[PDB]
Symmetry: D2
Subunit: 428 residues, 4 copies
């Protein structure tokens, strides 16, 4: 389905209208298959030469996985999407598509720990890429770090768990004036934020979190807006003839889809971070309720915040629109549908009190995740961010006394009662 | 289970004895979950610091996926295995674990097309790695290409579809004398060949093909023999303190498992090519019959070869032990359980006759795969190897008139009848 | 979880707190297994004798299926539930548990076609049970049909598709004064109606429809309120010693759970209508969003009704609270959360116009189902009710010109636009 | 595929040639769907009236489930099959299709406990059917129990666990001379026995056991040979017009498939024991290796028997061809491919020694099942047959000191070593 239809209609229909014509299955089939029989040899040759569309091999493309991709692109109003094995793989592929040995990336610092470790260590040692980390709360800091080796600017929508919101439009202008795309990780804010409306060229998701929403499946997505001009000379693999496809120019053959086409034909084909069709089936199920779920997550989170602000065992609370938040103005400007499910706070008595808070919980789940329907809590400095030095954790908005909550869609009075009994026990 | 038990007992038990203690499930549960609740904060901290074993997050580790890994390691007599999203990802990770920008790899040339394209283009452009391709039919050619920048030697067990078998022991000696591991891709010969018995240090699989065996699931495996010494100075990431894990030395903490540990803790955690637990469940089912299946594949293939050799529309036939095969001696020496399922031949009348052969088939499936229970046929020069120049295809053992068959486990008289009617039609 | 927690908290937690202790999986594992290893022979004997709780065999009981059952019982505030292969099997088992050859059942006539055919033909010919059908819009009609052979009264919550709502409290009093339970089929109104609050003793569900909510899985549920007294002499199988379990009296051993215990130990064990653990996994996912989904279904349906009432191609519209509905008073009294997703209407030009309405639709799915997230339409007289005579269809509230809609959770303006273009085309 | 193709070719192809034409999926898709969109209203009407073939609703029919059914029918050389939720449901439906209140069934007594309990108690109390149990080791005993109320004769292929084999041809003649079909439960002997070659008219399977073969899925099958004449006056529901389908005569419309058609259209539609498409997918995977698996099961079992016969802690051993077996002649005559996987024996020291045997095992699984790839052991008198009196257990071939083994496909020396250490411990 198209831009003329509403978000919820797309979330239920896009990419699977009409149903497959073999049997009419209303539900998207799970095509748990590796291979696809060809009509004849000409079919088979056209498919491999990129001269006709069809399925060849599940590593490269699969019908269940394609419905997921098409529906995500429709919801984002992008020109195409690619599904991959994890949010990490989506980030990896989004960068590696346009960068390699000797290249630079300007990144914000309000980052999930796993992105930090990929950027700072793995991409440098295994791909020769230098990521330059900046305080994205001031857009001038992004401009000052761009160089002729920069290939992209990278931001998260709501800094997990710093809870800062960058000025997307200002930073997108900076990236475009310097001839590079803005890539946004919108993991924590599907539906409530549309990056392509605000300057982003590329969106990645950890479909694992909110998109799936039920804590069952690992997966990632890369979405291409199709509006960046790859021919400025900084992205020659998207322009020059590709020896692997006998001379194909991606911009020439695939036009506005050049980028997501190469992600598939080069990186997915060769590095092989494909999603399972079963996992795709479950993510499609998640999308069908995503907007209802996100509205409830965000309504509960705002209530949780107000509860915590007035509680005697709590020393501070953060939320994208909290009074002390340095980017609340950006949160107000760009998030008009809810301000995310993630809430941080500190317990009086520091790290050891937070320890006893976590240990006392009876309904909230002490685990490593966000974006489950259930409410989740953790201590980031010793978990999601343990790979970082004390100085590094502070750059990303992570302190030693911090508790992160991913607020779920339980009845809020039950969440608050678990929080209260556990906060009382932490002061004993 | 251990080295004292037979292959089939291990294939049915290793890694899941005793059954999980929650309910006693005899079958391996499908843990379709992202996360795992922790006992308390100390548990959670020990797990992330690598100070205690347990599950944290399915990208990094999962109980269903772990049973698969443990059973593959037991069958291989390796010290550990890692599961990943595809055979391509396993190859990628096996190399990237020990190589990066400016490094070299010596590879054989009897290679699946997808490995060629990863080696020649993707790893060079995205990782700065120079793969040097050699004629592995003479081990002297491997020695002559090693340099001080070489990090590994790479071979396939039965060249897909050149059908050549390298001299593993001679090449393993060369690699070890030069301080680098031998990595073997044993995709086409699980059970019938044990690389670790013949000098290989690392084995990778495309679990997709024969291990799964039913054409349902994409997946890869990396298996570590645990016998290579990573401390010779060429593998400093396996020895030096890792900043991402606050100073952990992989050889010191994980000893013989240093390599497969870093594959998990670095590459899987950051690049994110994880396998789905559903896919793992299906690969475990495949292992339970693998030895029966491989014996039938190889018995049928040898019969198919004899049929083709005497048929009037066939100009030539290849098989690892065919009289004209330049490495039949190696095939005889190393494959004592069967000589693989893959068979090549040429039709009289060249490419256009093979075209009409493929188009006439009625039971054999014209698709891109090997290792299905069903019998498969294809024309490689325009498909699995289309990414290669005419000169390059010839280096890998692929001609323009070649038909590749993956012989399945149907009743051989039905396979032969389909082959015969289609060969008659190709001469019209 | 317990009656102290809210509906949404239960829907996310009940039956799986704490997570399984083997690994801590936050998601409910898919235990796709037939069998469960026993600790020793005493364990195994106690389990089969009904002297200890545990798992023995998936036909009889399974850990994934048990979580589903426990969560449904918690949401219903029943004492237990049983999962089965379909809504039809749940109805069958709910009756067969308490009735057999020579017994009677008093049923309402506002019935899904499949229930009618089971009641009128299959149970009579294969079980000797006489179902007496009555106009349940007047409770006096239920009393007048009870006899000393009656074993239960049976009602649907919202007559599918007559859209009538019975007076539950009045009819429950009648059944209880005559010593028989009231069994309610609450398929179309989970969450929005709680039968046990209004006199029902037994609830059955077609988990297929709204509970699943995504059109993926067939399944049924039987829920026992635990408040009916089975010892009045009409239910001797629940009281007398059971030879199959060496003398067990169900009321004595299982107390308030006697009924659902026999459903498992007798009917599920012997007739074998078990649910798959995969299907159960998906129904659990459905429950996690059920209340959000049902509120949206009912809000959209009420809007659709208002649209249809004012449209020139529509001759009439029905809805439980429509002005002409003979039971709107009951709908107002008992449904305080929404009035269901099902809407009927007639097109001007009769059966052939409705034909052209269905044939013109472009977003609404012409299929046999209700309770999908997508909007569905059909012509019942030739489909869901085709097994009934013209007189019989009229007894159930089905006319020849009727269109049934199951209103989904798409954006209502998109539903209405599809309805309007198709209604215009029907008048051409 | 057809009778011209071999068993293994059929097991890999029948029912899914050609692959679905939407995408060409070589693997059978998992159609996890409830519903199927119709082309238009005429389509929808023809489908419900039984005037055209197609899919309507997964309770009644599903594309994945249909491939399973078609492949089983092809392997059996039957005219059709029906899939159901369990082996118990298949037995139930096979009888209820042709019998009801006041009818009789002549059954053998060499029966799985669950069949006994269905026959003796559940079908009598819930369906009014009188099963007459006879010593089927003498065919004269079958003739002497037939009456004008008899509707079928029922046998198991290898009495589980009496291990007796009836004289199928003699008993089939008796049933046919008296105008009733012979129904065979071939659960324990797929592939190794073809009941339709020896007089059976109807075959049922517990697909759970050997057909699946991996202990993952519950399921049943009913297979119709299509050769019984239902018009002799004893089966009027198969001849007379069916009110539920407006006058359809099953023999007239469906001809040789009348029986399996009514199983679907009446019993599956109304009692609702449908199989999940996921479970069907797994059973199809099992079929692909069934013949290799059964040959290995039977070869290992015969070796286990010889080991047990010579062991000092064993007092007796039974096997269909054991020297003391009263039906070894029948086993020799009818089983020409292997004599089943099931082995019974007694330990010196009686029930308490067998207790200590079971408790000592370290590789063989103490669970309730047969037909897993793994080797299984149990004590039937307190488990699979606990529902029967001491007299009743003895009628079925079950004593108090009996150990039943389901011999798996592990390496036999590992099975024997587990058996030996556990037999030594039982004598302490």
């Amino acid at each position: 389905d198209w831009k003329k239809y509403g978000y919820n209609t797309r979330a239920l229909h896009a990419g699977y209208e009409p149903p497959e014509q073999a049997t009419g299955s209303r539900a998207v089939p799970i095509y748990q298959t590796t291979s696809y029989v060809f009509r004849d040899s000409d079919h088979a040759a056209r498919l491999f030469a990129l001269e006709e569309p069809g399925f060849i091999y599940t590593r490269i493309g699969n019908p269940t996985v394609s419905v997921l991709e098409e529906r995500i692109a429709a919801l984002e109003e992008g020109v195409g999407a690619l599904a991959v094995a994890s949010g990490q793989a989506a980030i990896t592929y989004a960068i590696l598509n346009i960068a390699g040995p000797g290249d630079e990336i300007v990144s914000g610092s309000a980052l999930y720990g796993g992105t930090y470790n990929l950027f700072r260590h793995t991409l440098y040692k295994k791909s020769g890429i230098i990521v330059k980390f900046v305080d994205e709360t001031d857009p001038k800091n992004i401009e000052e770090a761009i160089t002729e080796k920069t290939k992209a600017v990278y931001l998260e929508t709501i800094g997990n768990p710093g809870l800062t919101v960058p000025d997307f439009e200002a930073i997108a202008e900076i990236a475009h004036r310097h001839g590079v795309p803005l890539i946004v990780d919108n993991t924590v804010a599907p539906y409530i934020f549309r990056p392509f409306e605000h300057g982003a060229d590329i969106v990645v998701y950890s479909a694992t979190k909110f998109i799936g929403g039920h804590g069952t499946s690992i997966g990632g997505l890369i979405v291409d807006s199709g509006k960046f001009d790859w021919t400025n000379g900084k992205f020659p693999e998207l322009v020059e003839p590709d020896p692997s496809y006998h001379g194909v120019s991606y911009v020439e053959t695939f036009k506005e889809a050049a980028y997501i086409a190469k992600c598939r034909t080069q990186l997915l084909r060769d590095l092989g971070s494909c999603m399972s069709p079963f996992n795709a089936f479950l993510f499609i199920l998640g999308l069908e309720t995503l907007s209802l779920r996100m509205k409830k997550h965000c309504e509960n989170a705002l209530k949780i915040v107000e509860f915590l602000k007035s509680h005697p065992a709590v020393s501070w609370v953060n939320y994208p629109i909290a009074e002390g938040n340095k980017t609340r103005e950006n949160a107000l400007k760009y998030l008009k549908e809810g301000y995310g499910a993630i809430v941080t706070f500190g317990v009086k008595g520091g790290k050891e009190a937070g320890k006893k808070f976590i240990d006392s919980l009876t309904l909230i789940s002490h685990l490593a995740n966000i974006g489950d329907a259930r409410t989740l809590a953790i201590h980031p400095a010793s978990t999601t961010h343990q790979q970082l030095t004390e100085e590094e954790q502070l750059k990303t908005g992570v302190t030693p006394d911090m508790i992160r909550l991913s607020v779920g869609i339980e009845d809020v009075e039950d969440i608050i009662a678990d929080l209260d009994q556990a906060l009382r026990k932490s002061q004993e």
